[PDB]
């Protein structure tokens, strides 16, 4: 995306570097390569470790979404295996489950869940849900009432209620996990420290290479900038896993997979 | 080897650098190693981390398949332990669990499961399964009906129902975990340019190496190219552990083992 | 701060420039290759060290996230299981809110008396303040609420246990934070590092000056910034319960917790 | 100490380079160290990550056996605390649990468990175990039958029956884990590639240092080589956790510790 | 470690005065080779100290679980059997006994005084008879729970809730046992420790060509960095070693004891 602008600036920096090499020692400035080896290696080590942290936050995101599909699938399986006649509670619980997924998606994307929710629930409760500052948690509490009701109506025992309650728990952990990843980012000092350092390193590098490489510094220094810049750029494509880029999590696709999955297990 | 063809190319590029080395002065070419020491160390550091990430995908994928064997082994044990006489149920349930494994392998290899399914289940069921968006998930839900039936029949209590129920949860987690590794590759950005910049570094390397090595240049360049290139491609191999490469997982062996286990001696037990 | 030692590195480099006149006069040589070696080694160690510091930070944030999850689902279980017992709802929630603030005060080594008094009867405040661990005692109090529900027959051993597990989870959160605070790594991790990172940074100009001459301070400031930036960010991340910049907004996280629990039990602050 | 061969071949590889030295430049061949630092470092990085995998695998094998001891300790405890009257059942379950460990060791070493089985169990049960294609697994089935019938005899509720069933689940995870470790080495491509490069690098190296070290080539090129080889040999020393070499897991001693523990807990 | 630092300044002054005679013979020490060697040792020290750190972290987690399990077990006892203070005090004894006994076991020191202060000498003899005393303390703790269950004061459900806490301690015992027996590397740590030791002493000879009278200064700055990093992995590799820091294990056995007496109103002193 935005890297091409910074490598062409690096080509001109090299042109500026060759056209300026004659005036060099007259001013009194000597740039060997060896301290830039030190610096560049150092920057690579820190870039490597940072990029590690970023990949890990991306996979934790993806795991958290995998749990939603896992936990919702087995909740519905448990409903059918334990209460195979009660298709009325099936449809209601399933719609709260599908609501929860879509609501979680919209919450992380900071978008509006009204249509998805009205598509799935009566305005009777859709207003109760959006009346809360924590709508997705409220959907869980409502799904909780459903199994709670089947327990008090004697159709669930304490045991079988507990078996399903634990899947609510699993969805609660997904909710908190997602919220935690969304609010708490990879500390901003990483991008600030490394974006400066990397950008300044690629810019100062030609003036250090020209002593030894002469007319060829434009090439090998755009090379070195390319790998540093794109390694660094891939960290930022991974640190916001809930964003919209094609390189991010296809959250719409996953919510669709979830809905068709639960609607499949219900015969719809 | 995708490496054997490139390795030779690097030999030629190495030949070109030595024949046309003293001519550097005419065209205006100086080329030190130190900029390529730096560049190459950075690429090693990044190769190392990427390879680390791919092995993690390998071991998780191995692990997830490990749990199928475990969870199925113990669900059959619980049936033999709690309903020792219910052999028609034992037989029915084992067939679904063996279907689960083969079905999952096919799902992850994008191959057809119909042959394996019919080998193991009634054809009415082979069509209920093949009809679904997710057949592995349906095989699970049918396995859960069998123990759900024994529970309506009073043969299982809620407690012992839950004990067997938890093993089906365990398999749902394998299914989900396997889809996550399938459905999401690692970002192709990683693959898109990390493999080109390794090649690029590899071919240019002799052009900066000759001045110090002279004749010894084709050897040392191909050595360096070997290590960097085998590392990069091994990483891309283990990234797709449900693939069919030589270092991917033996999914077919593993389903065989699962099958042989659950049908150990006609499915007969003490 | 960090900007002070950056400045002194600019000083140390002009000291190098002026006393370069006298280098082999006094009998002095300083190539850069040895400092490249030392420099890279320190980079590697800073790389690993820093990675462990981030891991502690993520764990602390994760632990606090579990407070919210567990407390949410405890209130959820109370409402689904005992929809009528609103006094218990109110008392448990006031304990679970007391737990969060008391944990914040614990981790910050501050007095929890104000927040406790806001939230609970003074006879309980005194009980909680007497304990070598107020958060532990608050969990026990919460545990008596559901336990008394259980003696009265309103909870079964099963549904009592479902809720007990949540208190178990908070216990684990308590120990996890206790363990992250009560365990600074042996001071070797920092006086190997921030001593050597400091020392390396200010000797680097003397070694850089033969190659670079008047340029010394610029590269020397760049290398020193890079190393110092990395090394200081490590020190912030490893005390995540402190008051520094990159440290958990524990008061915000508590307010979110209280508001969530007030939300689920129909109350408006 | 399979390693002292290549250290000494290195010493003579440096002497060959000492004598062949000035035949170089009209032969024309030159070797500086700079490109070998590049390679040497790149290999050190790859050696580091590989040894890392090799170490995690040894730790997992040690963990797995560790929890055999944990889960059988606590399963025997539960039997004491819940059925203190029933020392006959105590002694049967303990022999199955001791048998499981021995059988799991034999399995992993591919040795005959028959003598150990016949020392712990009635020959009727030995016959059933050895008839299975998965003897260790079939030992768990038999142990589960013990507690299974204590359940049908009403001496265990479903609750306490389930408390002990979970310990058999834990042993099931040990068995599968060990089988998995046993058949899933660190991929061969790893150690295959490193050995070709680490070995080739260690012999070519003195050729590239005599130009700089002259007469001291051996003492420095051997010291560099001991370092890569001993680091790469640590991987070999950690590759078969279940074998019988000195650096492998003392599985016999662990199996004796397990038996000793379970007999301390039942007064034998 | 400081002794090996001052052997390095010696080796440096040797390398200065003897640099004269060196190449009358023809012995060269450049710096590029020792740079390649030192970076590789730095890299391996990086991964080694990573492994060591993880062993140290797992050790602190296991001990943390002791405090967690023992707190929640005693909380469970109070919330579920509020009246049974005699049982409260017996079980708290075993839990506290278990902590000190685990610590003594790990540091191979004598548990007898801690045991004789916490439990009756009939149970001290029983515990001290076993070859696995910490396990025997868990088994004893189990009997207390089991008797409450046979007396019908615990249901199988609520008996089971407390049983899980004992498993948690069982897991801690085994984990700690495994982290003790081990070094997982079978004494290679001695090979790679003296590899740092030798590199640090040949280093001033490789540096004197470039640095002359300055080499003792740059050579030991480097050596301090490498030796401190090594000795630190040595400290973390062995979190129960017979020359470790006992402050936190003692601190933890004291915290849990104090917590438990607090939780059972044996603190504070009555009015
Ligand atoms: Cl689940
Ligand atoms: Cl299992
Ligand atoms: Cl929860
Ligand atoms: Cl256990
Ligand atoms: Cl007995
Ligand atoms: Cl399990
Ligand atoms: Cl071996
Ligand atoms: Cl006994
Ligand atoms: Cl606990
Ligand atoms: Cl008491
Ligand atoms: Cl009390
Ligand atoms: Zn689950
Ligand atoms: Zn239905
Ligand atoms: Zn209806
Ligand atoms: Zn709107
Ligand atoms: Zn399992
Ligand atoms: Zn059968
Ligand atoms: Zn030539
Ligand atoms: Zn939870
Ligand atoms: Zn209420
Ligand atoms: Zn366990
Ligand atoms: Zn007995
Ligand atoms: Zn072996
Ligand atoms: Zn716990
Ligand atoms: Zn009491
Ligand atoms: Zn006290």
Author numbering:
A (entry chain D), D (entry chain A): 22 to 289
B (entry chain B): 22 to 291
C (entry chain C): 23 to 291
E (entry chain E): 24 to 294
Give the text the authors published on this PDB structure.
Alanine substitution mutants for each of the 12 residues were generated in KpBest and hBest1 and subjected to crystallography and patch clamp, respectively. Moreover, the equivalent KpBest mutants (W16A, G18A, S19A, L259A, P262A, G264A, and D269A) all showed an overall similar structure to that of WT KpBest. The corresponding “Ca2+-binding” sites in WT KpBest are occupied by Zn2+, an essential component in the crystallization buffer. Notably, the short extracellular domains of hBest1 represent a challenge for quantitative measurement of the surface expression by labeling techniques (e.g., biotin). They can be classified into three groups by different molecular mechanisms: (1) mutations on residues involved in Ca2+ binding, including W24A, G26A, S27A, L294A, P297A, F298A, G299A, and D304A, likely cause defects of Ca2+-dependent activation; (2) mutations at the neck/aperture, including I205A, I205T, 3A, and 4A, increase open probability by functionally mimicking a constant open state; and (3) mutations outside of the neck/aperture, including D203A, P233A, Y236A, Y236C, W287A, and W287F, alter open probability through the neck/aperture residues.
